[model samples]
Target: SRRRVVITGMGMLSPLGLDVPSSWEGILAGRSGIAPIEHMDLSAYSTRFGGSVKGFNVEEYLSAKEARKLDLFIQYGLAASFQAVRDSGLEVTDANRERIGVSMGSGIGGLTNIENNCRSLFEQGPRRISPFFVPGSIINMVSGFLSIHLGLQGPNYALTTAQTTGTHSIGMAARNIAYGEADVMVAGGSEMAACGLGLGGFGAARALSTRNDEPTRASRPWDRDRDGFVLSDGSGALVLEELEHARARGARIYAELVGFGMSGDAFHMTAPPEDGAGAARCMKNALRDAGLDPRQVDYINAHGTSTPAGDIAEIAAVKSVFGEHAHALSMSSTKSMTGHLLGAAGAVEAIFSVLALRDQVAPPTINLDNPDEGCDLDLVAHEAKPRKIDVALSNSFGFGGTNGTLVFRRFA
Candidate 1:
């Protein structure tokens, strides 16, 4: 028989806030975190606004010496993982240490670090590079440092699938538990690519909104005025424990992760088909895996990044997957408030999904003033709303047509 996995704790460092509780409060309030980019020069860029993390104290999580060797992404990952473990109240004793592990990832591991080191190489020669460059910027180091810090020994790794990285990380971690690889896992994704290079690249690719004058209102998902997504830096981590293990320890369960589905667009590298066929297949797969009918799902945390094509495509996918029931279920994009967290989007949204199940409220899509054509599914726009939610589905689609869907069932 397959084992069951449940989320006992969650932690996050987002543009909206430094921790889960603060971020959740922002989400429920429908507050927009998108703001003007200020850390570097963006005068020549088409988009100058984004979701940037504020007031994060690295000293609170790590020593200055240790923090300096790691990139911002790694620091964010460690903070979230440590918080998740602490929230779970999991004792990592020598006897049970080997049964726990970590899985974390990032879309772009350390763009700022890479950019800085590249400048050093060009301006000051090879000898100018720091010894910790590789380890600090590598994608897998989040898992590496987290495992080393917590003494987890079961399985440790990180995967990079652009925006879908977090979903895949948590999905694979759950599979590892079901396959008897570990009893507990700290799994998620982190990203810190809102630096100069990151902004320059995405802005040049024409993938960002140019509403520099209205930064807070730029990410208007499903609204006729939307241009593109807002890139943000953040991390999200979850403590997933085997159901029996959590019960034995009397750990409080947030929600049960019932199903995970992944699919490739196979049609385009950057966009889904007009019909959203791949996204529909992914959702259907998750429903089948969960043994639940489409009607049973009460809410959806859409991967609505406020882009014209993506917003409509996701709505089409939902309609295709749920049919008439699509009109009955409540859905919203928390990205409207948090901006797009890139690698951390899936994990952060997944946690929001569980929070929806726990509180029976669908988070708001803040700037959806005028829903675009073909985007008329009951989006909880402008304000959060209470609902009878028994199950929630979270979705994430990365740039390379990678799509993932996660289903969470409320736990008694």
Candidate 2:
């Protein structure tokens, strides 16, 4: 028989705030976290703003010496995981450690480290490169550091699915537990790519917003005048446990992870299909996997990245899947407030969805004063609204046409 999965705890370090509660608070208040990029010099770039995590101190979560050896991406992952593990109160005893695992991912892992080391190789010779360079910057290091710190001895996996990294990581980890390979899993995604090369590359692709004069209003998803997504940094973690195992431990259940689906557009390197066919199929598959009727879903945390094509594409996709029920469902892009966390986007948005289910309140898409054509859903715009949500979906689509969807249902 297959096992059931439930979310016991969650943690987040986003541009909105450094922890789940604070981040959710900001979302409920319709606050924007995007601001001028100050971490690195970007005088030559057209995009001068991003969703940068504010007031984060790695030393608060790790020892100074240990923190210095890891890249910022790994550090963010570790910190969020630490908060999740603590929140779950899952004691990692010798008897149960092997039954716990980790699944963490990053879209563009350690680009800052890569850029710095490359500069060293050019200006200071290859010999000056730091010895920790390889392990520190690699994508898998997030899982490696997490498993070591938490002493989780089960599956330790990592994925790099551009923007879908977090949703896929959490979905795959839930599957690992459902198949009886483990009873508990720590899963989510992290990213810290707000550096010179990170911005320059995306700016060159014309993927980032250039509204430096109005940083707060730049990530206006589904808005008529919206330009592009604001590159951001952060991490989000969730403690997923087998339902029976959680009950035995008296764990506090947040919600049940009932469905997960993924698909590839196979049409473009960066842009989604204009008709949103692939994304619609992905959501249909997820609803089928969850044994849910389209009418049962009450909310959607949209993958509305504020890009010209991405926003409309997702709207059409949702309409395709939900049909006439689409107008009745409340959907909002919290990315409007938190900016885009890239690889961490799905996880952070998933947390917000779960919170919505818990609080019976739907977060709003800030700065959505003017909705574009075909974007005529109940957006809960500009202000959070009180609504009972029993079933919620979170959508994430990334570069390379990769897409992922997760379904969360109220735990009964």
Candidate 3:
């Protein structure tokens, strides 16, 4: 039989706040993190707003010299990892160093560095590029730096499946512990893609909201007037330990990772099937893996990215799978406040789901004053709702037709 796995600690650096408590507080209060892009000049961009992680001091987590050697995305990863490690109270001893691991991911790693270095090589010369470019900008460096800093020697892994990266990382890390590959694993996702190229690319694809006049009201998932998603920057981490190991250490258990399901649409690169059959199958697989009936699910952190097609498709998928039980449970898209964190969406939302189970309060889908046709489920619109939550599911889908779902249960 596979060993049990539970989340003992969590950390977050989000548009709402720099820590998990503040972020969750903002989420529950329905505060919007979307704002005009301030990291750079937005004169040339049509989509001028995003959920930027502001007021973050890199020196708080790394020395000045060390911080300069890495990229902003990696710094966010390290900062979040520090909080998670401290919260978990996991001491790294020589004997147990090899038993701990890290699995962090990012969809678009080090865009700032890559963009700057390319500009330097073109404007100046080849020799003008910084020596740290390669190591600093790679997608896998988040896991690499985390393992080195935390002194963890077990499975060091990373994934870049766009939006599903973070969710897949947590699910894979749980499997590593359940299969005896590691006793403890630090897993999550980070992203800092609010730069020029990041915004320009998505803008060119018409995947961003153009509601520049009212930025906070831009990401209105399931609303009648939402245009598109607002890009965001942040990182979220979770410390997962084997049940026996965590109990021996007297760690506080937050929730049990009971089910993980993954599937491919095999349809389009960036669009879900019109019927949402692929997404429905993915959720059913997760419930089956957890040995759970659809009726047992209490809340869902939806993948409603505020896109017209995506939002409607996800609701269709949920209605197809849950049927009559769809209206009985509460489902909300916290993205209605935090915008879209791209690769970090899954991990951050997973932490939110865990918090929902702990607090027994479902976060609100803000700006959802008017639900679109066919989106008539209990969306918990406009305000947080107090409820008895036992099983919470988080859904993440990526650009390459990849989908992942994680089912978390309240700890007994």
Displacement of residue 145 (Cα, Å) in model 2 is 0.9
Candidate 1 lDDT score at position 383: 92
Local accuracy by lDDT, each model: 0.91, 0.92, 0.92
Candidate 2 lDDT tens digits, 1-412: 7788999989899988889999999999999999998877788999989888888999878899888878889999988888888999889999999999998899999998899999999999989898999998999888898887878999988999999999999999999999999999989999998888889999988888899999999999999999889888999999999999999999999999999999999989999998898899889988998999989999999998999999999989988899899999999999998888889998899999999999999899999999999888998889999997999999999889998999999997
Report lDDT (Cα) of residue 137, candidate 3.
Answer: 84
Stretches of model 1 off by over 4 angstroms after superposition = none
TM-score of each candidate? 0.99, 0.99, 0.99
Model 3 weakest 10-residue run by lDDT: 270-279
Q: Whole-model lDDT for model 2 versus the true structure?
A: 0.92
Residues 1-412 of candidate 3 have per-residue lDDT tens digits of 6999999989999999999999999998899999898768988999989998989998988889989978888999888888988999889999989999999999898999999999999999899999999998898888898888878898998989998998999999999999999999999999999888999999999989999999999999999998988999899899999999999989999999999989999989988887787789899999998999999999999998999988998899899999999999999998998888888999899999999999999999999978998999999999999999999999998898999999999987
Candidate 3 lDDT (Cα, whole model)?
0.92
Badly placed stretches (over 4 Å) of model 3 are none
Could you tell me which residue pairs clash in candidate 2?
Answer: none
